[PDB]
Amino acid sequence: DMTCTITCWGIGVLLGIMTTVGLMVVGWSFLQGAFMGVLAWLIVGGVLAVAVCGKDNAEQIRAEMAAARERVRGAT
Amino acid sequence: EETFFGNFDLASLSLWLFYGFFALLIYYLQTENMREGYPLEDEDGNTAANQGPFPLPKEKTFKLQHGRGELTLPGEDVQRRDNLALRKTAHGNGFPMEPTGDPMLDGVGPASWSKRRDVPELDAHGHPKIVPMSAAEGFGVSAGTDPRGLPVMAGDGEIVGLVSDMWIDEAEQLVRYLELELDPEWGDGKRLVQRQMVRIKSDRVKVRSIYGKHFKNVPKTKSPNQVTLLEEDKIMAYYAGGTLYADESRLEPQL
Amino acid sequence: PEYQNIFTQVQVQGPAELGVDNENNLTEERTTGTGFSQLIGWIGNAQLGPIYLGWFGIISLVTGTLWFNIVGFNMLSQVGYSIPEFIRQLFWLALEPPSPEYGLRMPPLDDGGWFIIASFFLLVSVISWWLRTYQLAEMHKMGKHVAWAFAAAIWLFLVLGLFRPILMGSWSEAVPYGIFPHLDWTTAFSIRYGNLYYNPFHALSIVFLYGSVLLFAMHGATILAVTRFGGDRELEQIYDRGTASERAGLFWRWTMGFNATMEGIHRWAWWFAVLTPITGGIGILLTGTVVDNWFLWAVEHNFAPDYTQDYGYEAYTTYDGFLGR
Amino acid sequence: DLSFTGLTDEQAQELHSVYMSGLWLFSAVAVVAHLATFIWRPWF
Amino acid sequence: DLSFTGLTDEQAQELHSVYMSGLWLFSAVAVVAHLATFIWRPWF
Amino acid sequence: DLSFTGLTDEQAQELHSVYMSGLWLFSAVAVVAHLATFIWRPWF
Amino acid sequence: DLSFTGLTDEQAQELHSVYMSGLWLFSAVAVVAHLATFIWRPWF
Amino acid sequence: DLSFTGLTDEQAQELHSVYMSGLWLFSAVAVVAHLATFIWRPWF
Amino acid sequence: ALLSFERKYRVRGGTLIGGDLFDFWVGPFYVGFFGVTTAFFALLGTILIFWGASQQGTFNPWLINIAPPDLSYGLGMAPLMEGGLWQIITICAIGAFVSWALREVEICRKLGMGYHVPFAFSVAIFAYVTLVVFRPLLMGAWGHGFPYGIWSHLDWVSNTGYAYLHFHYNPAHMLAVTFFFTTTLALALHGALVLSAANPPKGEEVKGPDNEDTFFRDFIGYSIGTLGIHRVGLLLALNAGFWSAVCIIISGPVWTKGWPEWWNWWLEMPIWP
Amino acid sequence: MSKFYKIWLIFDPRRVFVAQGVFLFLLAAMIHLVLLSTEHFNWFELAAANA
Amino acid sequence: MSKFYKIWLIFDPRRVFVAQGVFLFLLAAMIHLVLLSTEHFNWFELAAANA
Amino acid sequence: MSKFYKIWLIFDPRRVFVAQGVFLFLLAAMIHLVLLSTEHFNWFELAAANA
Amino acid sequence: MSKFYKIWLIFDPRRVFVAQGVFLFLLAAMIHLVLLSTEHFNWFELAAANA
Amino acid sequence: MSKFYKIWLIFDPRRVFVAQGVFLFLLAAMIHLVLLSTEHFNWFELAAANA
Ligand code: BCL
Ligand SMILES: CC[C@H]1c2cc3[nH]c4c(c3C)C(=O)[C@H](C(=O)OC)c4c3nc(cc4[nH]c(cc(n2)[C@@H]1C)c(C(C)=O)c4C)[C@@H](C)[C@@H]3CCC(=O)OC/C=C(/C)CCC[C@H](C)CCC[C@H](C)CCCC(C)C
Ligand SMILES: CC[C@H]1c2cc3[nH]c4c(c3C)C(=O)[C@H](C(=O)OC)c4c3nc(cc4[nH]c(cc(n2)[C@@H]1C)c(C(C)=O)c4C)[C@@H](C)[C@@H]3CCC(=O)OC/C=C(\C)CCC[C@H](C)CCC[C@H](C)CCCC(C)C
Ligand SMILES: CC[C@H]1c2cc3[nH]c4c(c3C)C(=O)[C@H](C(=O)OC)c4c3nc(cc4[nH]c(cc(n2)[C@@H]1C)c(C(C)=O)c4C)[C@@H](C)[C@@H]3CCC(=O)OC/C=C(\C)CCC[C@H](C)CCC[C@H](C)CCCC(C)C
Ligand SMILES: CCCCCCCC/C=C\CCCCCCCC(=O)O[C@H](COC(=O)CCCCCCCCCCCCCCCCC)COP(=O)(O)OC[C@@H](O)CO
Ligand SMILES: CCCCCCCC/C=C\CCCCCCCC(=O)O[C@H](COC(=O)CCCCCCCCCCCCCCCCC)COP(=O)(O)OC[C@@H](O)CO
Numbered sequence A: 001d002m003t004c005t006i007t008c009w010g011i012g013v014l015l016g017i018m019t020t021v022g023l024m025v026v027g028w029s030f031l032q033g034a035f036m037g038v039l040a041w042l043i044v045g046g047v048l049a050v051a052v053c054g055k056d057n058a059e060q061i062r063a064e065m066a067a068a069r070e071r072v073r074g075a076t
Numbered sequence B: 001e002e003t004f005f006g007n008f009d010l011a012s013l014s015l016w017l018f019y020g021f022f023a024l025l026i027y028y029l030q031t032e033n034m035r036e037g038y039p040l041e042d043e044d045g046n047t048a049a050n051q052g053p054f055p056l057p058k059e060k061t062f063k064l065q066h067g068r069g070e071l072t073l074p075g076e077d078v079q080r081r082d083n084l085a086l087r088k089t090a091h092g093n094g095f096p097m098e099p100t101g102d103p104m105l106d107g108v109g110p111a112s113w114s115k116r117r118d119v120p121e122l123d124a125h126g127h128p129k130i131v132p133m134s135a136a137e138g139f140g141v142s143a144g145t146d147p148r149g150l151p152v153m154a155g156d157g158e159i160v161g162l163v164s165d166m167w168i169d170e171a172e173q174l175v176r177y178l179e180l181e182l183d184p185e186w187g188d189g190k191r192l193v194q195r196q197m198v199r200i201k202s203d204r205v206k207v208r209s210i211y212g213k214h215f216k217n218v219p220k221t222k223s224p225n226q227v228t229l230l231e232e233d234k235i236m237a238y239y240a241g242g243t244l245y246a247d248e249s250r251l252e253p254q255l
Numbered sequence C: 001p002e003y004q005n006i007f008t009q010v011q012v013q014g015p016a017e018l019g020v021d022n023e024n025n026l027t028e029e030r031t032t033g034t035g036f037s038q039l040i041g042w043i044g045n046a047q048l049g050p051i052y053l054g055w056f057g058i059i060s061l062v063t064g065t066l067w068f069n070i071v072g073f074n075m076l077s078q079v080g081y082s083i084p085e086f087i088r089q090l091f092w093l094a095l096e097p098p099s100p101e102y103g104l105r106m107p108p109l110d111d112g113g114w115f116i117i118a119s120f121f122l123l124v125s126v127i128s129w130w131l132r133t134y135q136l137a138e139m140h141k142m143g144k145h146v147a148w149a150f151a152a153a154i155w156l157f158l159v160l161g162l163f164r165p166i167l168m169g170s171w172s173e174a175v176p177y178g179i180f181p182h183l184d185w186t187t188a189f190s191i192r193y194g195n196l197y198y199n200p201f202h203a204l205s206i207v208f209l210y211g212s213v214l215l216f217a218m219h220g221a222t223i224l225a226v227t228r229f230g231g232d233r234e235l236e237q238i239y240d241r242g243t244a245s246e247r248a249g250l251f252w253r254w255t256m257g258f259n260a261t262m263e264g265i266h267r268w269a270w271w272f273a274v275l276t277p278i279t280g281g282i283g284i285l286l287t288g289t290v291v292d293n294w295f296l297w298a299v300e301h302n303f304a305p306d307y308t309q310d311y312g313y314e315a316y317t318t319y320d321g322f323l324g325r
Numbered sequence D, E, F, G, H: 001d002l003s004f005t006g007l008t009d010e011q012a013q014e015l016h017s018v019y020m021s022g023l024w025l026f027s028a029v030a031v032v033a034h035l036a037t038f039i040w041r042p043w044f
Numbered sequence I: 001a002l003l004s005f006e007r008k009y010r011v012r013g014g015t016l017i018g019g020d021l022f023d024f025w026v027g028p029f030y031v032g033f034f035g036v037t038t039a040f041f042a043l044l045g046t047i048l049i050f051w052g053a054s055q056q057g058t059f060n061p062w063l064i065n066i067a068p069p070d071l072s073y074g075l076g077m078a079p080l081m082e083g084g085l086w087q088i089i090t091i092c093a094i095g096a097f098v099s100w101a102l103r104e105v106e107i108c109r110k111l112g113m114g115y116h117v118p119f120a121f122s123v124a125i126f127a128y129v130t131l132v133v134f135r136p137l138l139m140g141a142w143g144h145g146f147p148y149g150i151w152s153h154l155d156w157v158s159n160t161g162y163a164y165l166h167f168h169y170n171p172a173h174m175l176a177v178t179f180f181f182t183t184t185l186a187l188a189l190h191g192a193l194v195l196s197a198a199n200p201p202k203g204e205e206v207k208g209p210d211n212e213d214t215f216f217r218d219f220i221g222y223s224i225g226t227l228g229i230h231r232v233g234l235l236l237a238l239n240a241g242f243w244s245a246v247c248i249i250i251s252g253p254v255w256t257k258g259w260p261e262w263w264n265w266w267l268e269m270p271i272w273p
Numbered sequence J, K, L, M, N: 001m002s003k004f005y006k007i008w009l010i011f012d013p014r015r016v017f018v019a020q021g022v023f024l025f026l027l028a029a030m031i032h033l034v035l036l037s038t039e040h041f042n043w044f045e046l047a048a049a050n051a
């Protein structure tokens, strides 16, 4: 699952490139649009590598792990 | 501000004082780095006429842990090899030497090992530092691809066996060795590979240094649970020598 | 190609290490609680924490946070408590040292009094972090090399902020607290006293800084090339010489005619790094107090170059010819 | 049937009831605020 | 009964009661302050 | 039956059935909003 | 039968059979959109 | 009972009772201070 | 003369070119094909430097200055006294540096080691070729290179920075200075830690890696480890040299105005009121 | 529309609640700041204008 | 069309749900801001110019 | 609405209280500073000008 | 043809489906933005000019 | 209101006492500095001006 993390960082790089070109059509200069593109990359690509890659596969395995964490507490 | 004489002022005095201090510091630094490998010798094992411009340092003592004793340097060379299968290619000094038999089996050239202590390295509690993972309480693969169960491919494209275990350093939490079980066609028993000589992929583990036919002559550990420093040096040097001795085209000029 | 050892192939995790102890009872002041980061573990260790809390560290943290907030709140109040403008001009604001007319006396709070109160809290913080670095070696029963190396940089810190202003007779000689404003101080200091290139101790400091960076490229690269022989376990190589040390020494011996040992290369590294702030501070302490124009000093001592050609653009071209007309 | 969290169907229904009940009040407050703002200063 | 924390249904009621009492005290103080501020200098 | 996710055919049928309900709600609300905006200020 | 992926000669037929139905739908929708835009603003 | 700190109900009542008596002293000194300052220099 | 453990490593083979025609040692030095090319280039360069010094009129090491040609010569060749000697010496220096790197490669191959050191030296070669070949070609004249003089190559640095008014405001120069300072702080810390572990107070035993890891987690709450510190030092040093090359190649061919003005994009961003 | 309660058969309630708590406040702050950057709907300047 | 329900035999519903939520919110915000960047469709300026 | 007490069966009381305290203090400080940044509502300046 | 279905015996359905979605959305956004950068095909300006 | 004592069954008094003390002093020092930063409430300048 390091391969899903790298994919998610690349979708962030691609959104950053699109943010630059979009602000330039609306009237901003390159460097102004590229600072905003860098933040789109870092905030969104980071968020997606925690949320999407953290919905790891497990199916009844997920269930039992969670139902057993719910047994650790109760006596903690 | 005034000068003492001519153009000499406080800055000049400071500069010359630093010059003197730096000369003394250079002398100290060069002398401190001569505690191993001296006195110099010629190509026949005799003491050389020239010993250089700096004299040798006085002695220091190190008090070792776990009751291993004391170490005094500079002293005699205790890591010296005894009978090396090498031959001079010239009558004087400055020319290379030729192996007499098999360079990889004789431990010469890039396959040379140093005669270290025949005991394992210990951690803070006095226990062996490198332990197989099947006996290490609480350890698991937390990231990356697990190589256990994958086949191993040699440098010429042959499958020689399977990865059975991993040997880890528990104090520093790092993998040090991979353990390989050989197929009967390529030898018998188990061998070790240092981690810095493998490339772990999704379906295989690649060792480029040596070929398949070289896998039966890898040195073997005495105990299945611990490895001493001497065995470590002989195993690592064996793999390192294959980068030059595996094929005759690796030794000739590449041009 | 062969594996290069820049990123770890597979990570393993076990119980967290809490540290070694002896009769000094370091466990009593250590925090409980650790973490693990797999992103960092691709390069180095993955464990985070724990940390030791003594009195020196607590005092240093409290007094350093006070300095930061006096500066930050002064910067915020200079702008009218406007947060968006505070963000817009963050790199340009500063807390300015006092005016030259006040000498070494206490200035008005609007003209350097807050600067002096905040400087006293930063001083206290830095000297406390150094007493912590000395105490921990003493408690760990190790040498005091770290504390000495830290005091080497503290020497230049104190020369810049404390000693030279006192010898010159004005608090106005100190450095402002800002990002750009402090770089303007560097350029103005160089311009005011001739050319700082011609200060010999500045040249020596540059020599040692260049040498320290060349040595980590050489030492880092050399240690990474002998890691297939266990070369990153340096202490055991010192206590029992192996083939990694022999090959590392022979590489440099065959390259440039002399080499070092496993233990002795770290002394070379320690000295080059330490020598940069010492020579720098000696050079700074001599400016204004002894030498007022370093280029005239170089002309006096005969290491200033001379040029034969002329000055001016019309000695080489024409204004119309530079425009294409 | 299908569960990734360990919750059963009854637990999911019970949770959703309270979630919707707590989500409607927030929207009611927002609607009142928007009406007051529109009367103070319209935008359409 | 579902519980991700370890508390019981009875235990999670007294805590909510005390929390709500504190919330109401805080809100009452804030409302009085806002009324005084509006009387002193208005904004609408 | 090919199932990378580890789901059976009936579960997928149920999930997709309820999924489509949400799409068709979101879409109707969007259609109403777009119609109102077009009546306010046309763009075609 | 070649099978780099974990599939057979019957699962792939079904997969392609439906995938092609969705391809035709996006393409039908795109064609109608292009026809509308040509009437509104010709480029040829 | 619910105790994450291992104190009992009565020990908690003892600590609180002592704590509030210092809180009131702090608040009292501060009010005499604010009063002297408004009489000395009003801010409203 | 050999060290006590050196004889068993002096074997034949591992050359890129030359075979056993140059496979020997002179004193401690190894010679090969690239040892013969290094000697030739370096000796020619030094002899030409001293001939130029003799023709200049001074032998003082502080005052020797060999300079590039005028800008009016463009990318052509100048007379040997008016800047052509600089061009010849530049060619000789490039040859010597490349031969040094290829000699290190052969030594690494013979010892069975990794090739990290020549790769690290390639970065310093790249920063020098940017200063004397890449920026000058882009700017259109060889006269943009720095002169070969101990105290005259600092005048070039001073004048080149004030040609952009306030050089401290160059964004890529700020990154490069930070990398330099961080490498020196990390080298000092590493040397101090190793020496303090190997040299305890008199009457005490030596320490191990566990003790080093513990001291640093107690001091700052984190420890990179014995393997991570070398990777980090190498990466910091190589990043320092790469960013230095960038700071100089944008100053001329990419930007013409003062460097403070470049920051205007931040000051007039449309979000600001 | 009567089967939406199964969303908690897929999502962990704690993560969803934390994410929603962050998102709602961030969006409210963004809108309250967008209003203040105009001339018509800035209530701080309007109060001074009518005094 | 009657067999699109098998898309959940290849895609994990949790991942697609998170990605779709993020994508939809970002698209809505981008469209609203693009409308705000014009002159004829800026409803904050139209209110100013119609009162 | 009579069942809002069940939030404590999802979130641990200890953490939520710390975050609430930090959030409330930061919000109050920000609002007081925002009031201080204007001309109409700066009560120090108003007291200075009213005497 | 009639044998194109064997494309799914070489390529993985899950890798092809994510890559195609990303490519399709990026291409649609790029084309719309290219249209918005012209004079004759910018409908936001056309609406303002007409009315 | 009469059950507020129970905060000591949730939060450790040792931590909150130190936290309070630090918070209280830092708040007091900030008010005095803001007061000292004004032209009307700087009581040191008043003594010089008044006489
Ligand atoms: C116009 C610019 C001037 C110039 C003006 C100056 C001035 C002025 C100075 C330097 C100085 C230096 N110059 Mg110069 N310099 C110029 C051009 C150059 C060039 C070049 C052209 O390539 C180079 C390579 C250098 C390089 C150098 C360094 C060799 C030297 C700094 C030494 C040092 O240790 O730094 C590292 C810095 C330190 C050790 C500072 C100490 C930091 C302390 C210890 C930090 C304490 C902790 C802190 C407060 C806590 C922070 C918060 C934490 C997160 C908790 N200069 C030109 C000529 N230069 C200095 C020097 O020594 O002069 C001789 C100096 O003062
Ligand atoms: C020049 C070297 C600099 C440095 C580095 C440094 N310090 C560090 C780290 C690093 C690289 C850490 O990773 C570690 C840390 O966890 O920081 C948040 C830490 C630290 N340095 C600290 C102190 C400290 N360092 C100081 C100095 C410095 N340390 C320098 C600035 C100083 C001063 C004033 O000189 C102080 C007082 C603490 C802030 C922290 C001590 C670590 C600690 O207490 O960890 C407790 C464990 C935890 C549960 C917290 C971890 C956070 C996550 C919840 C864990 C899960 C990990 C997650 C996947 C990633 C997040 C981690 C990120 C750091 C990447
Ligand atoms: C030999 C000279 C070189 C050198 C060496 C050197 N520096 C050193 C040392 C040594 C040997 C230390 O032992 C010491 C140290 O602790 O290193 C880890 C240090 C140190 N050198 C430092 C800085 C530094 N050194 C520099 C220079 C150099 N130091 C030279 C290159 C430079 C520059 C300008 O180049 C800087 C900026 C510090 C990281 C550290 C000294 C720590 C110290 O005294 O801290 C006082 C602390 C406070 C100000 C209080 C804390 C208040 C903070 C503002 C906020 C809270 C802390 C938080 C962890 C940071 C914010 C992060 C958030 C995410 C939480
Ligand atoms: C990250 C990049 C860092 C780096 C890396 C680096 N350099 C390296 C290495 C590495 C890893 C080596 O392995 C290698 C070595 O063997 O070191 C001992 C080396 C090396 N880098 C050196 C020096 C050096 N490195 C420097 C810097 C750096 N090198 C960076 C900080 C600097 C400066 C200015 O900061 C210098 C001066 C050499 C000591 C050494 C090997 C170079 C060498 O010997 O080349 C063979 C050439 C000769 C023996 C003589 C050549 C003669 C010429 C034909 C004529 C001279 C003309 C010259 C241009 C005149 C200049 C006059 C000046 C006054 C301006
Ligand atoms: C003036 C003379 C030099 C010519 C002028 C031009 C070059 C100038 C630049 C650098 C000079 C470096 C020359 C080094 C060449 C060494 C050749 C070699 O190999 O010499 C060895 C002997 O050397 C050594 O053992 C190492 C010598 C130190 C290395 C350089 C230190 C640079 C330190 C600091 C940076 C310097 C900047 C200045 C700071 C100014 C400060 C005010 C023979 O072999 P050995 O076996 O090791 O013998 C020894 C022992 O073993 C006995 O047995
Ligand atoms: C090929 C073309 C060359 C390129 C042309 C470019 C010119 C410049 C380049 C290089 C110059 C260096 C040349 C010197 C190298 C000599 C070769 C060598 O070293 O040869 C050794 C013989 O030793 C020596 O000849 C000893 C040299 C002494 C070094 C001085 C020490 C301090 C020096 C410096 C301190 C610096 C501080 C500041 C400085 C200012 C202050 C100086 C064979 O050794 P061996 O037989 O193994 O054993 C014997 C061993 O132990 C020791 O006798």
Ligand SMILES: COC(C)(C)C(=O)C/C=C(\C)CC/C=C(\C)CC/C=C(\C)CCCC/C(C)=C/CCC(C)CC/C=C(/C)CCC=C(C)C
Pocket (backbone or CB within 6 Å): G002, M003, M004, M005, M006, M007, M009, M010
């Ligand atoms: C003007 O100057 C510039 C530079 C701008 C130019 O324009 C220069 C231009 C050139 C120099 C242009 C040169 C162009 C070419 C050489 C073009 C060549 C193009 C091709 C050879 C294209 C090949 C395309 C292949 C395609 C589309 C293949 C499709 C195959 C299938 C759909 C079948 C595969 C599928 C299955 C099912 C395989 C069966 C599987 C089993 C398991 C049985």
Ligand SMILES: COC(C)(C)C(=O)C/C=C(\C)CC/C=C(\C)CC/C=C(\C)CCCC/C(C)=C/CCC(C)CC/C=C(\C)CCC=C(C)C
Pocket (backbone or CB within 6 Å): D014, D015, D018, D019, D022, D023, D026, E002, J027, J031, J034, K028, K029, K032, K033, L004, L006, L007, L009, L010
């Ligand atoms: C001008 O345009 C710009 C760009 C400026 C914009 O502003 C654009 C803006 C948008 C595009 C905005 C879009 C906004 C949305 C999509 C908003 C959506 C909002 C919601 C769906 C909100 C939901 C809120 C729900 C709430 C508040 C729920 C509360 C619940 C509770 C308080 C109770 C929780 C407790 C429970 C469930 C415990 C029960 C436990 C058991 C064990 C039974």
Ligand SMILES: COC(C)(C)C(=O)C/C=C(\C)CC/C=C(\C)CC/C=C(\C)CCCC/C(C)=C/CCC(C)CC/C=C(\C)CCC=C(C)C
Pocket (backbone or CB within 6 Å): E011, E014, E015, E016, E018, E019, E020, E022, E023, E026, H002, J028, J029, J032, J033, L020, L031, L034, N003, N004, N005, N006, N007, N009, N010
């Ligand atoms: C940027 O735009 C501008 C500037 C206009 C803004 O300022 C915008 C601002 C906002 C959008 C602001 C939004 C603000 C909020 C959402 C505020 C919310 C506030 C609250 C919900 C406050 C909560 C709580 C406060 C208090 C005092 C609660 C509780 C106190 C207690 C003492 C509880 C005690 C409980 C105990 C002891 C339980 C013990 C029980 C046992 C059984 C052991």
Ligand SMILES: COC(C)(C)C(=O)C/C=C(\C)CC/C=C(\C)CC/C=C(\C)CCCC/C(C)=C/CCC(C)CC/C=C(\C)CCC=C(C)C
Pocket (backbone or CB within 6 Å): H014, H015, H018, H019, H020, H022, H023, H026, L028, L029, L032, L033, N027, N031, N034
């Ligand atoms: C102008 O605007 C700006 C930004 C400048 C502002 O100034 C903004 C300011 C704010 C937003 C300020 C906000 C301020 C607060 C919310 C302040 C709150 C203050 C308190 C709650 C204070 C509480 C103090 C309590 C005290 C002092 C209690 C007790 C003291 C004791 C000594 C008790 C002793 C206890 C013992 C011995 C325990 C007994 C032990 C046993 C074992 C029984």
Ligand SMILES: COC(C)(C)C(=O)C/C=C(\C)CC/C=C(\C)CC/C=C(\C)CCCC/C(C)=C/CC[C@H](C)CC/C=C(\C)CCC=C(C)C
Pocket (backbone or CB within 6 Å): D002, F014, F015, F018, F019, F020, F021, F022, F023, F026, J003, J004, J005, J006, J007, J009, J010, K027, K031, K034, M028, M029, M030, M032, M033
């Ligand atoms: C003008 O040019 C520019 C570039 C400026 C543009 O603006 C270009 C813009 C575009 C190109 C835009 C493109 C937009 C799209 C492609 C939009 C597509 C939108 C959809 C496909 C939307 C689908 C929505 C469907 C939803 C939300 C489905 C389901 C949601 C739920 C069902 C929620 C409930 C879930 C539950 C209960 C889980 C079920 C689980 C069980 C076990 C039963």
Ligand SMILES: COC(C)(C)C(=O)C/C=C(\C)CC/C=C(\C)CC/C=C(\C)CCCC/C(C)=C\CCC(C)CC/C=C(\C)CCC=C(C)C
Pocket (backbone or CB within 6 Å): C068, C069, C070, C071, C072, C073, C076, C116, C119, C120, C122, C123, C157, C158, C159, C160, C161, C162, C175, C176, C177, C178, C179, C182
């Ligand atoms: C308001 O917002 C909050 C609350 C978040 C903040 O707090 C924000 C804070 C900031 C945004 C802070 C920003 C801070 C900086 C940008 C700081 C920059 C600081 C420097 C570059 C400092 C350099 C300092 C010193 C230098 C270069 C050299 C030497 C100094 C000294 C030796 C100082 C010591 C002084 C002494 C000994 C004199 C004391 C006087 C006596 C009488 C004893």
Ligand SMILES: [Fe+3]
Pocket (backbone or CB within 6 Å): C219, C223, C234, I194
């Ligand atoms: Fe080292």
